[model samples]
Target chain A: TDSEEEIREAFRVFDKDGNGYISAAELRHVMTNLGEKLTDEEVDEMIREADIDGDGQVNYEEFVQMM
Target chain B: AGYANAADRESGIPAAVLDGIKAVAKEKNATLMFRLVNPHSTSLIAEGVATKGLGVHAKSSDWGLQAGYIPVNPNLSKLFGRAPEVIARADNDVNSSLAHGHTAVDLTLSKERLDYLRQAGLVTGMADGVVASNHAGYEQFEFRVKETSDGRYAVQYRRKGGDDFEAVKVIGNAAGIPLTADIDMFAIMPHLSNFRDSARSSVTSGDSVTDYLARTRRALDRERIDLLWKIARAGARSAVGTEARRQFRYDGDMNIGVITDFELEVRNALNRRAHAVGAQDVVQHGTEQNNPFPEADEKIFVVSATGESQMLTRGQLKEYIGQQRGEGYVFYENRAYGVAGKSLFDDGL
Candidate 1:
């Protein structure tokens, strides 16, 4: 439950515009803060790896799983 | 300035630095070891980017952990463009990511640069005194100094007993000698005395004399040159004490000259063995080394910038300052004295 709450807060941070989904730009910014720099292609690939629904964005489920 | 060749994907490291790194690798067999040798020591990771022309790789573990890397070549910083200093190695290749993974990076400094920094009063990132490794207690060390009436100075070993720093021997002239320069020579007395006691206890607990000597030789070889000096000095001190005690046991007056001669003999033996093991440079004055340990509950002055700088126990300085303890105060005289622990935001005052 604690981990779930932490992940929820992290998801909220990544969903910068309160859109309930993390975009490529949002993910890149978060990764940069984590000391990981990703190219456009790498960012796209990361989203693709986690966004199984083909929506081109990472929802809470995808974000939690990726984390 | 950020990397000049960042757009071209060129490593910003200078050719000369790269060549120097190659030479160090060639000489030291490509294995450069680095650890935080002292609490105040700087990391190459922080130094590289600040000095310019270094690219750092940006990579994070799954848990977002990062590793530290400072390229021997200054050009590497160009590709990475002054990325934040991370503790995790950049997992990406040097070409794609600026950080070089766990691969060794040169931490060598030229002698000319060292001398220039020393001349300028700038720290050149080197230590001269012995640091304890693989030893319990004596984490921090100091030598006692006193100023006489006519402004002369005296240096003495801070024996382990309270109320008696002056009771021990004084090494330097109260006048004329550079007290600061001679402190290292005097500090060796207490360090060796403490080590002798430790070694004696080890021997008493069934460690064979020959085995102990062999093990010590290996340890000295593996340790830093400064630490190697401590082991050598300690061994010599132990030898002298053993012989002196034996002679005194047989005769009440075991002439001071006889003890001095025996001390010299043991010191020479220690020097010979240390040299045979390639640690001879650590041995100080061949025949002049002699001292006794402090008794329990000794108080030593820590000459710091605060109220706590007054005489205190050996344990107080080492134990009292940490993340938890002295959080409000400048923990190790490295910052301002006597700040409260509460954060400004938390205190809201």
Candidate 2:
């Protein structure tokens, strides 16, 4: 349970520009810098599985649940 | 009225909980999706069609579409009072598009809720399905919900890799009222594939385990020797370039010629060594060797591409010369008092 807060903090760092949501482009950009190149289609499929409320953006709640 | 099998029912989850799930789905206008592996299974409700031994009632759905425009099997109206249209069909032709034991059902259920159902044993392979790019080497169907140009949402489905996706359902018409007709609710009793079950139980006692792993010392040493030759070539090339650059400071054409002299000598000799050792010839020159010695015997002034020359020993010369540069001793020439060309600095410039 304590690790949940740490995960949330990591999520916030990826949520650059303080938009309160993580977009697919943002996720892909961060991942590329980390050396794992992912195609847009792959990211789309990942988002579809994680976005619980059907919103295109992955909100904090959905991100937590996905983790 | 009764479900076909009591053994298939998840006993831990109360009937009321299942009803509540259906109620929430109904309230949220979320459509229930089904994936039928065997279309002729008994679980499919058909009024006049034969059962084929499969027994399960998957609520009231149009089963995508009817063969003669009436509804598949036990028409949706007869089962539920209303009917739902066939949104799309699975892209399976002769083989399963998704290696997911033939089919899959994707729905907008919360992960927590799905986990609960899984724990209750209501579904099989819910967590075990592998997310592969293709279904058994064949293209599978995928659905995407996108906004139309005029400000509404359209749900499109098509075989993956197809040119276009046909709109199966559209939400929010002209005035923005959430239509309920597009939603269909249903129950599912997932089957455990018999093939997977048989495979899992067929393994016998294991044999002895060997410790012959990869990246052994012998393998590492072999790779290191190959890398050593490549490093030798790179270092030699850089040294030649430095010689050329130094010469260029005093004269253009003259210095360029001096630079090329060293470039050719170093590259030719280095390339030969690379060829002998079966390493890549890093130099961009052709293979031609006119030198008499197998290796350099003494020191010789090596000019570079940048108009400079450095007095290097036969060993130093050998370090740079490879098969790609045409053997190693050509740079060992003792012409003109052990020096081919004098440095511009030596001329007191």
Candidate 3:
């Protein structure tokens, strides 16, 4: 749970567009800053869980709720 | 080795060869060479060299362990036992490929020898046994020998007679000593000799049908079935631990024993099963995605905690990515063939 909170805060900082869902492109820019190397599929899957509305992307507000 | 139809059906391998290929392909993302019906069914598969080499996460400079435990020769106690060799060695890619050009052998055991090994637990060891960290009383009654001009035999061991070959160990002089237990250079010679002739034939005419047929058959007949093993490997490879320079070797899931990136394997396996039985007519599951760690700390933590951490060497990771790309081609062909089989011919005819 702590990891979730920590990861959520991290996402908030990275969700530049604040679209409420992180696209693979958005996740890539953020994750790249974190030195991560995720493929588009991986980022999309991670966002799939966070985007409860089924918008297929993670925005800042929804991303925070997951944390 | 006896007729165990239920067991074969359950595991998707002929009763006898189940364990051998299980243990062989256990460590890598690979597939069987062909489908299995019974003992006579010559099914073999290769672990995908691409995904673990060239695919995602595998491209990292530090991927898998270089020197693998000598499972074929578990403990190095025996005079002619196996020794730990870095199968992910840079030299093997071209050297072994080139050496194979000189002399190759093909072989078949008489029904008597095959049955004999089955009874002695020799064939089973080759088929279903694990080469664990130590070299135990491992025995394979069947294997191939490629004689190099420098007087060494790059021996490829196998249990079932098929194209998907693994547990390949190089011996200094195959002609001088016995291959398996009592099986000799002569007994395994037919296979080796045939292989040599084929290699030379291919070299001369630029048609290497033997290896080509073997690779293609694995893709067509046993791709889905073998995909399960790769899922397990993904789990196993990701099962790196805190205290070892090596990753675990397992015959089955129980022994592999790690779960940090567990979802990768679980989802992968489940997806593969879905693909295999055609449950995907309603919902299509995509290829198994590797758990991505963008940061260096995350990558190290993932690898070290994932069982495969220790198994990776710097070179292996690069190769893993490269090989995955190569396997992508094979996987595409296999999926197409499976779809075609389902839509066109239910019997896989």
Candidate 4:
């Protein structure tokens, strides 16, 4: 249930568009909430690490799963 | 202009780019070795693509779900946040898709062109802390190239919050476009002092294994390079506090000297490596060099961008360090004070 709980929590927080993959903009918001002030460079690195698709964005599934 | 040779079935833009991509991909293994040495440094990649390799995979396309990083689409205006300076290119390859899958294309990275990328990559680190965040942080990487009317090239970049563009870095016309790499500034070792204290206390008191492991892991994961330098400086400072003679040894009133010196030395070493390997000959194919270790019960590790492949720790490090060294180190004074700390960083030792 921990895995399931993590999935639920991550989806709840990451699904800004509610459509799916996380966008760079959405991740920016999440990062801000995490007490982390990042520049576009940091955000890009996170996105690259998370968005395996190279979509210039990401999704809840991808974001939550990446960490 | 999109792909001058687009219409020609055989000599189309995509065809040409694909050939170029393959030309570089042929040496993908050698490129991997270079990356292994340099990690995320693009100078090696430029070297890989320029000499032994051909040109950049100049075409842009959506390889399945994977979109390209270059040929930045004009439609993503929001991401740019500001109007981008427009430039005209004669050899733009316009990629189109058909029924099921899309056609493949590539571009070549000339030796001169690769040098430009390598130079830009070196400076990308300065922006890491300001721009790049710690674990789960988001950042942007901007690579810009412009040609001057006088037949020279002017290159610069601004990380997200960077007020002014870094110094106008220049490159020779041996390559077509002049370029610069910029990343947001970040602290190198944010937790150096804390880690040092923990390390010292733990070592002196012989702390618990669990505590030591956690502290060690934290220290290892500290992302900011500036912080690391400060920590080392702080250590040297504390050492001097106890013994005045040891004060002026490594890090003292000569902060700028030590720091700038280290940076210059690192830069020169990177340049030497880039030059030695011939930045043009490197390739751009992904590797299993760093693989993932999914949890035991979990079937997948569902990462963000590339769910298709899992990278090893080494692979991830390769990407980061390679990019930093190839581009250049990022520093505070370089942006604000413009003071080169020789002892700390270096000017090629």
Candidate 5:
């Protein structure tokens, strides 16, 4: 219950540009913190999973659903 | 969801498996959540399909069809719907042509949906039936993977509902060019949401179990926390990547895929240990050695393609790699984890 809302806020942080989406840069902020050192390839890989529309980043819905 | 036997064994999970689950969750202080099994069963499976063009190598960055057509089971339409979002995977690490690991894959297909699209000119397009990839000392066999008449293939994920264990087979397309179809394995996950509330019981007191668990362990050193977290994440992913654990002892051999440095050092060593143990199911957990943590030296862990924590004696590990015809990554630190040119454990004592 609370996680749904809280998780959205966390994604909000990942959406650094505030475009309601998380781009690679914003994603790096979180991924690195998660301790899996990733290259540009790694970041792109993560994005690919949730990038339904494939603009190279994940939208809020995509990110949340993936989680 | 009906069962032939009303006994707990018919519906309840295996005792060993359940204990293993409880043991892991308790150790991690993770919040446990349960969901009603839509079509209840004690089995689920997903695994890597090893081979060159025959495996995940066929997937592109976005998992687009650019690389090649991915194979799957056409029969998935019955398990999922026509156009399920079942994700297929390949190991760039195992497949050399993949310069970078296919860390992510999004390409998906379905038989019915694919038929409609191609019939309607949609993907012209997208592909199943997993075909057996091997037979060896481990003794492998092929399953009902269908042949493609139209240059199209499909991927169907199966649970142990009726003990489904088949390999992927993607054959020549009857169509002019190759195409694919996918189904969503996840469709089954959320459909039984009503019971999700039962798992929600993890929340108690003002704070959820998550909060309590953390506060209980917050006193630990960050190093300790990091070790546990890494172990947990690695094990979790391995479990997901190869629910093949249900398979216990049968997955022919390691594709020895493309992650040369990581897979070789880690897998070679683990499989060697399996050899010493004279057991095929052995290497699945990797070889346990001295603990990396202060809590205990009886450290247990799983080594991921890039993530590994077990310490090997410099001489023995180097020798293991040498025996396996492995290259680079040597540590004078006596025992270490490393890649072709370096070791993550090199500098430390």
Candidate 6:
């Protein structure tokens, strides 16, 4: 899971709109893909936990940290 | 707002609150008022007060019954002595239930000096004591109390729910909570200190409400951090649990140390996220690793919040931690004041 390139690829795929960041909605897709269906609260927690800059979105670097 | 006389499906406000209720109230120039946690039944009551100005006394013993909302209903207004009055938990005081249920049981301390039945050994919901409910062996309890011609008061309570109200017996019997009219109550109360200290209580003989409200604020604050702590603990275990379960559902190719490290960072992130509203110090300091609760398998973790729950505020918890750890205090659950109690809780989420 910590493979740098693998992590980067996952980030780009989860970014969805190619916004260079994964918003809560986009990240919800990532968890759902992982066979984990999270509530809005739980998904928000996942983003909030990974979002180091606290901009309410997760970028490549933050996603790498998260994975 | 009026969910009264309506079916459960028709009850709560149908519209989604896109913005928050507080913000919406401000935007609409409407004042935010009481919101009862229990929506059903209560909806009909509050709707009457809001729309028709009915005299409904919607009383309850559960926490968050009022929740910063003022009751303007005439029935409750009367109970408020025609003024605004509040009790933290409604059930703690039965005087709200009409002279402690005396209207039905007419014969008084003076009038009915004759045949009387006395209940013994309170199973305990604290009722209306300096202390609140003692959530020990009993789920529900009964007790008797009376005021003398003098200033003193006498109390008799059931220690266990299974206990029967029988003939008077004292001197600490095996069957039930025992006390005597003949003995001094102060002498017997020491054993009940854990029961007395459990919830939001008037700790001393002369307790002031001013002290309690301040106590309420800090207790609520600690609970916010405790929430994070509980979540973090769960997250740690949950992450590691799936890793091993997978390959073995699918498996941990990672070594034990690597897996443990992953769990630790997950906890840290969950904890770190809350500081924007200011609770980081509580989280960052508790960098638990390895076996956080080495004894928990045997001891159980989420402890008895029934005893001294209200008493163990975060400040007091940290203060005790200071003494135990020497130079600086740590905010571990078992290490601090004690297991955080129901003092920081509502009836439900």
Top candidate, metric DockQ: 6
For B1-349, candidate 4 gives per-residue lDDT tens digits of: 2222322222111222223322332221111111111122233233232211112222222211001223223221112222333221312321221111222222223335434433443322323222121211123333333444544333334554654654222121124222112110111211112123432342423433334445655642234422222232233222212122111222211111212222222223333444454443222111111112111111111111111112224335334323332222111111221132311221211
What is the Cα-based TM-score of model 5?
0.18
lDDT of 3 at B130: 27
- Model 3 over residues A1-67: C-alpha lDDT tens digits? 3233233323433333323345667555433332234567655665565578887876656644643
All candidates' TM-scores? Answer: 0.17, 0.17, 0.19, 0.19, 0.18, 0.17
Candidate 6 residue-wise lDDT, B1-349, digit = tens = 2212223222222112101222332332221111112222222222211111001122421111111122222222113322234433332232332232111111112112111111212122334331223332123334444556753234333534666543212111112211111100000001111111211122322222234435655532333323332332233223223232222110122122212222233323322332322222111111111222322111111101111101233345333323322211111122221243512111111
Lowest-sum lDDT 10-residue window in model 4 chain A:
A1-10
Indicate whether candidate 2 or candidate 5 has the larger DockQ: 5
Model 2 has a DockQ score of: 0.01
Instruction: Give the winner by TM-score: 1 or 3.
Output: 3
TM-score of 1: 0.17
Which of the CAPRI classes, incorrect, acceptable, medium or high, describes model 1? incorrect
Worst ten-residue run, lDDT, model 4 chain B?
Answer: B182-191
Candidate 2 off by > 4 Å: B1-349
As for DockQ, the candidate ahead, 1 or 4, is 4
Candidate 5: Cα lDDT at B131: 29
Scored by Cα lDDT, where does model 6 land? 0.28
lDDT string, candidate 2, A1-67, tens digits: 3244334434543454335677787655543433235578755655566679888988877766753
Could you tell me the fnat of model 5? 0.00
After superposition, candidate 1 runs with Cα above 4 Å error? B1-349
Q: List, residue by residue over B1-349, the lDDT tens digit for candidate 2.
A: 1222331132111222223323432332221111111222121111111111001112222222111112222222123222344222211210221231212221122233333333433333322331122222122444344333644334344555764865442111122221111101011111111011111122111110011112233322333323222222222223223223223221211111223333344334433443443332222321112111222224433322221223445455434332102211112111122243421111111
lDDT of 1: 0.30
